[PDB]
Write an enzyme that holds these catalytic residues in place. Structure first.
Site, PDB file in Angstrom:
ATOM      1  N   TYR A  27       0.764  -1.251   0.000  1.00  0.00           N
ATOM      2  CA  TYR A  27       0.000   0.000   0.000  1.00  0.00           C
ATOM      3  C   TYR A  27       0.793   1.300   0.000  1.00  0.00           C
ATOM      4  CZ  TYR A  27      -4.042  -2.895   0.339  1.00  0.00           C
ATOM      5  OH  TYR A  27      -5.033  -3.817   0.066  1.00  0.00           O
ATOM      6  N   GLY A  29       3.076   4.062  -1.545  1.00  0.00           N
ATOM      7  CA  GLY A  29       3.557   4.612  -2.796  1.00  0.00           C
ATOM      8  C   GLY A  29       2.737   4.264  -4.017  1.00  0.00           C
ATOM      9  N   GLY A  31      -0.500   1.867  -3.623  1.00  0.00           N
ATOM     10  CA  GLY A  31      -1.839   1.378  -3.314  1.00  0.00           C
ATOM     11  C   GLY A  31      -2.385   0.179  -4.077  1.00  0.00           C
ATOM     12  N   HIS A  47      -3.786   5.600   5.088  1.00  0.00           N
ATOM     13  CA  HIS A  47      -3.536   6.856   4.375  1.00  0.00           C
ATOM     14  C   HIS A  47      -4.250   6.822   3.026  1.00  0.00           C
ATOM     15  CE1 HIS A  47      -0.845   9.721   2.069  1.00  0.00           C
ATOM     16  NE2 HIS A  47      -1.238  10.455   3.093  1.00  0.00           N
ATOM     17  N   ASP A  48      -4.191   5.688   2.339  1.00  0.00           N
ATOM     18  CA  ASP A  48      -4.885   5.531   1.062  1.00  0.00           C
ATOM     19  C   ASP A  48      -6.402   5.696   1.265  1.00  0.00           C
ATOM     20  OD1 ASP A  48      -2.385   4.958  -0.080  1.00  0.00           O
ATOM     21  OD2 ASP A  48      -2.664   2.830  -0.145  1.00  0.00           O
ATOM     22  N   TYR A  51      -7.238   9.434   1.870  1.00  0.00           N
ATOM     23  CA  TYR A  51      -7.346  10.149   0.603  1.00  0.00           C
ATOM     24  C   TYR A  51      -8.637   9.741  -0.112  1.00  0.00           C
ATOM     25  CZ  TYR A  51      -2.498  12.001   0.435  1.00  0.00           C
ATOM     26  OH  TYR A  51      -1.304  12.666   0.608  1.00  0.00           O
ATOM     27  N   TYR A  64      -0.767  22.416   1.347  1.00  0.00           N
ATOM     28  CA  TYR A  64      -1.340  22.885   2.612  1.00  0.00           C
ATOM     29  C   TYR A  64      -0.200  23.471   3.440  1.00  0.00           C
ATOM     30  CZ  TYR A  64       0.480  18.288   3.769  1.00  0.00           C
ATOM     31  OH  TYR A  64       1.306  17.190   3.908  1.00  0.00           O
ATOM     32  N   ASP A  89      -2.148  13.329   5.982  1.00  0.00           N
ATOM     33  CA  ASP A  89      -0.689  13.242   5.899  1.00  0.00           C
ATOM     34  C   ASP A  89      -0.057  13.233   7.283  1.00  0.00           C
ATOM     35  OD1 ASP A  89      -1.009  13.223   3.164  1.00  0.00           O
ATOM     36  OD2 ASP A  89       0.139  15.049   2.774  1.00  0.00           O
TER      37      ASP A  89
HETATM   38  C1  LIG Z   1      -4.056  11.291  -3.946  1.00  0.00           C
HETATM   39  N1  LIG Z   1      -4.173  10.179  -4.900  1.00  0.00           N
HETATM   40  C2  LIG Z   1      -4.997   9.087  -4.647  1.00  0.00           C
HETATM   41  C3  LIG Z   1      -5.056   8.424  -5.979  1.00  0.00           C
HETATM   42  C4  LIG Z   1      -3.566   8.548  -6.301  1.00  0.00           C
HETATM   43  C5  LIG Z   1      -3.145   9.268  -5.063  1.00  0.00           C
HETATM   44  C6  LIG Z   1      -2.484   8.565  -3.910  1.00  0.00           C
HETATM   45  C7  LIG Z   1      -3.534   7.776  -3.180  1.00  0.00           C
HETATM   46  O1  LIG Z   1      -3.066   6.724  -2.258  1.00  0.00           O
HETATM   47  C8  LIG Z   1      -1.639   6.831  -1.874  1.00  0.00           C
HETATM   48  O2  LIG Z   1      -1.347   7.638  -0.999  1.00  0.00           O
HETATM   49  C9  LIG Z   1      -0.558   5.942  -2.494  1.00  0.00           C
HETATM   50  C10 LIG Z   1       0.607   5.743  -1.533  1.00  0.00           C
HETATM   51  O3  LIG Z   1       0.228   5.049  -0.357  1.00  0.00           O
HETATM   52  C11 LIG Z   1      -0.079   6.442  -3.822  1.00  0.00           C
HETATM   53  C12 LIG Z   1      -0.142   5.598  -4.925  1.00  0.00           C
HETATM   54  C13 LIG Z   1       0.266   6.035  -6.177  1.00  0.00           C
HETATM   55  C14 LIG Z   1       0.750   7.320  -6.342  1.00  0.00           C
HETATM   56  C15 LIG Z   1       0.813   8.171  -5.254  1.00  0.00           C
HETATM   57  C16 LIG Z   1       0.407   7.733  -4.001  1.00  0.00           C
HETATM   58  C17 LIG Z   1      -4.965   8.288  -3.365  1.00  0.00           C
END
Ligand SMILES: CN1[C@@H]2CC[C@H]1C[C@H](OC(=O)[C@H](CO)c1ccccc1)C2
Length: 121
Positions: A27, A29, A31, A47-48, A51, A64, A89
């Site tokens: 998960y 970088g 997800g 965190h995923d 978001y 931010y 974050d």
């Molecule tokens: C903010 N965006 C979402 C869709 C791409 C991104 C990142 C997301 O989830 C993440 O934070 C992961 C890392 O855990 C991620 C994956 C791919 C690119 C960047 C971040 C939700």
């Protein structure tokens, strides 16, 4: 923004976001799917999801502002999206710090095929 998150991660943990947390487990970088590999990977799962609570927000690019009150992160008022992204974050950076004791290099560059199955937020 992703760059700000990376700076926050380095400040909190002493580890560079790339490469310590950009390709870690299932998960971090990138997800997706699978059972998180350990506590650090669970930080990224949450965190995923965090978001994911913000459909009409743009976490990668939206910037931010935050400050330190002694070691504590205090998100400063911006737009609603900025405030919510900052809280996501902040939580992840704290979570990474709380789980440095089990961080494992074997999960860096973890291959996608070892991550299967949906895990609901
Ligand atoms: C903010 N965006 C979402 C869709 C791409 C991104 C990142 C997301 O989830 C993440 O934070 C992961 C890392 O855990 C991620 C994956 C791919 C690119 C960047 C971040 C939700």
């Amino acid at each position: 923004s992703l760059l700000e998150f990376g700076k926050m991660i380095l400040e909190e943990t002493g580890k560079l976001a790339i490469p310590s947390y950009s390709s870690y487990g299932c998960y971090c970088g990138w997800g997706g799917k699978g059972t998180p590999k350990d506590a650090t990977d669970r930080c990224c799962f949450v965190h995923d999801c965090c978001y994911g609570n913000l459909p009409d927000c743009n976490p990668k690019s939206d910037r931010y502002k935050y400050k330190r009150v002694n070691g504590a992160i205090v998100c400063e008022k911006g737009t609603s999206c900025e405030n919510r992204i900052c809280e996501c974050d902040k939580a992840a950076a704290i979570c990474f710090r709380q789980n440095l004791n089990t961080y494992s290099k074997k999960y860096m560059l973890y291959p996608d095929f070892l991550c299967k199955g949906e895990l609901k937020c």
